[PDB]
C-alpha cells in the first residue's frame, strides 16, 4: 500500500503539470484573436477541471 | 488493480443478425469506456468513445451502451467486413486501478502518425528498446500508450507517459521490468530484463483528447525473445 501513496503524488504532479502548461493568454490580435484565446483557454480550463476531479476520485473514491 | 471482464470469448452470427458484447468493470469507472475494433495483421481501430459515442467515419450499426458497472456493443446489421476481433478499454492511466483491456470477443460472420521501431529476436536477458517516433500531432502534451499482444492473445496496456512531463504510469505485472521515456519526435519502451514470456507485438497508441481513449496507433513492432 505504500505504493498508493506515491501514485497519487505521481497523479497531483500531473493535474499541477496540466493547468502549468494551460497559461493566461498573450494579449494579441485586437478583441478577435484575444476574445478567441480568451474562449479556448476558458474551454480547456473547464477540461483540466474535470479531468482532475476524475482523476482524484479514484483516490477517494 | 482495474479488471474489464469480457464475454463471450467467441461469436458465430450470420449476416444481418445482433452480435451482443459485454464487459464488467471491477471498479466504477463511468464514462471511461472505449471500443476496439482489431483485424488480422492489422492494428486496433477506434469504434466507440465515453461509453456511448461513435467514432468519425464508424457505421451506424455499432451502439455503445452503459450501465454504471456494466458496459455493451451492439453490431445491428451485422456484413461481412464485421468478422474481426473485439475488446473494451476501461479506465484511466492516471487513476488509482489504472487502465485495462477485456479479454477480448472473436467475432465470424456466415495528420497524425505513430510509427514503432526496434522489434528484434533478443536473447533471454538483453536490454531491449522499442521506439515510437510522433509526427504531426497539433497537440504538444498527450498520452501515448504503449500496448503488447502475444501472438494469439489478447491485448495488453504496458503503460503510458504524458508526453509533456515525467508522468510514468504502468501496470502491476509491467512496473519494474518496463521504462517509457520521453525525447523530441520520439517515445521509448525499455524492456529491463526480457524472458520469453515478453514475446509479442508492441504497438504505440495516441490519447489526443486527454479523456482516456485511443484514437490514433502505430503499425505494430514484432518482439521475439527466444535462444
Known amino acids: 500500500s505504500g505504493d498508493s501513496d506515491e501514485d497519487l503524488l505521481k497523479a497531483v504532479r500531473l493535474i499541477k503539470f496540466l493547468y502549468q502548461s494551460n497559461p493566461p493568454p498573450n494579449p494579441e490580435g485586437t478583441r478577435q484573436a484575444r476574445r478567441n484565446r480568451r474562449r479556448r483557454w476558458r474551454e480547456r480550463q473547464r477540461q483540466i477541471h474535470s479531468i482532475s476531479e476524475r482523476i482524484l476520485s479514484t483516490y477517494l473514491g | 488493480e482495474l479488471v474489464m471482464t469480457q464475454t463471450p470469448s467467441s461469436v458465430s452470427e450470420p449476416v444481418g443478425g445482433t452480435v451482443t458484447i459485454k464487459c464488467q468493470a471491477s471498479?466504477?469507472?463511468?464514462?471511461?469506456l472505449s471500443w476496439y475494433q482489431q483485424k488480422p495483421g492489422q492494428p486496433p481501430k477506434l469504434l466507440i468513445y465515453?461509453?456511448?459515442n461513435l467514432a468519425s467515419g464508424v457505421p451506424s450499426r455499432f451502439m455503445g451502451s452503459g450501465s454504471g458497472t456494466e458496459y455493451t456493443l451492439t453490431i445491428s446489421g451485422v456484413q461481412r467486413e464485421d468478422a474481426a476481433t473485439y475488446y473494451c478499454?476501461?479506465?484511466?492511466?492516471?487513476?488509482?486501478?489504472?487502465?485495462?483491456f477485456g479479454g477480448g470477443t472473436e467475432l465470424e460472420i456466415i495528420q497524425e502518425q505513430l510509427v514503432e521501431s526496434g522489434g528484434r529476436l533478443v536473447t533471454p536477458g538483453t536490454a531491449l528498446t522499442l521506439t515510437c517516433k510522433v509526427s504531426?500531432?497539433?497537440?504538444?502534451?498527450?498520452?501515448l500508450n504503449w500496448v503488447r499482444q502475444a501472438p494469439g492473445k489478447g491485448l495488453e496496456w504496458v503503460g503510458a507517459?504524458?508526453?509533456?512531463?515525467?508522468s510514468e504510469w504502468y501496470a502491476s505485472w509491467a512496473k519494474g521490468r518496463f521504462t517509457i521515456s520521453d525525447t523530441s519526435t520520439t517515445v521509448t519502451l525499455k524492456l529491463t530484463s526480457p524472458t520469453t514470456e515478453d514475446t509479442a507485438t508492441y504497438f504505440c497508441?495516441?490519447?489526443?483528447?486527454?479523456?482516456?481513449?485511443?484514437?490514433?496507433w502505430g503499425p505494430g513492432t514484432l518482439v521475439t525473445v527466444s535462444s
Open positions: 507517459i504524458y508526453r509533456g512531463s515525467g
Open positions: 478499454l476501461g479506465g484511466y492511466p492516471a487513476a488509482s486501478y489504472r487502465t485495462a
Open positions: 471498479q466504477s469507472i463511468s464514462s471511461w
Open positions: 497508441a495516441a490519447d489526443t483528447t486527454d479523456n482516456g481513449y485511443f484514437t490514433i
Open positions: 465515453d461509453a456511448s
Open positions: 504531426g500531432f497539433s497537440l504538444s502534451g498527450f498520452w
